[PDB]
Amino acid sequence: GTGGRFLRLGGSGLSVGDIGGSNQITIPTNALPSHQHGIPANTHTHSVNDGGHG
Amino acid sequence: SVNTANANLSINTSSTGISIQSASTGLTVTSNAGNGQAFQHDQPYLVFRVFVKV
């Protein structure tokens, strides 16, 4: 059955009638290009606790 | 003569007026996370044999 596939000559280790491939492709983890994210501007304060000192 | 004597006094505790203003952690970018790796992809296919007419 054709299966709506593409025509591929199979000289390299592919007997006649061989199938395979996939229309759906999944990006593997190691395929992700290196990139850097920017951290936005930040600002904070800490409250201070003190009962007193003699 | 008047003998030496102590003025019996003590210090009442008070909480210091102290506050902490704003600050930024200073970081602006993350660390690179990713490697550029070759990733295998194959479209659906069927394999035949080609013959050229002599």
Residue numbers in the entry:
A (entry chain M): 218 to 271
B (entry chain O): 326 to 379
Question: What does the article say, verbatim?
Answer:
A-1(L) is a Myoviridae cyanophage isolated in 1970s9 that specifically infects the model cyanobacterium Anabaena sp. PCC 7120. Using cryo-electron microscopy (cryo-EM), we solved the structure of A-1(L) tail machine, which consists of three parts: a 205-Å-long neck, a 1045-Å-long contractile tail with a complicated baseplate, and six pairs of tail fibers. The dodecameric gp2 portal, the pentadecameric gp5 and the hexameric gp7 sequentially constitute the neck of A-1(L), to which five neck fibers are attached.
A-1(L) possesses two types of tail fibers: six LTFs/gp34 trimers (274 Å long) and six STFs/gp33 trimers (258 Å long), all of which anchor to the baseplate in an upward conformation. In contrast, the 180-Å-long arm domain (residues Pro156-Val379) of LTF is folded back and lies along the groove on the sheath. The overall folded conformation of these two types of tail fibers suggested a state of A-1(L) in prior of attachment to the surface of host cell. Further competition binding assays showed that the arm domain of LTF and the stem-CBD domain of STF could simultaneously bind to the surface of host cells. Altogether, it suggested that the STF/gp33 and LTF/gp34 are indeed RBPs, which recognize and bind to different receptors on the host cell surface.
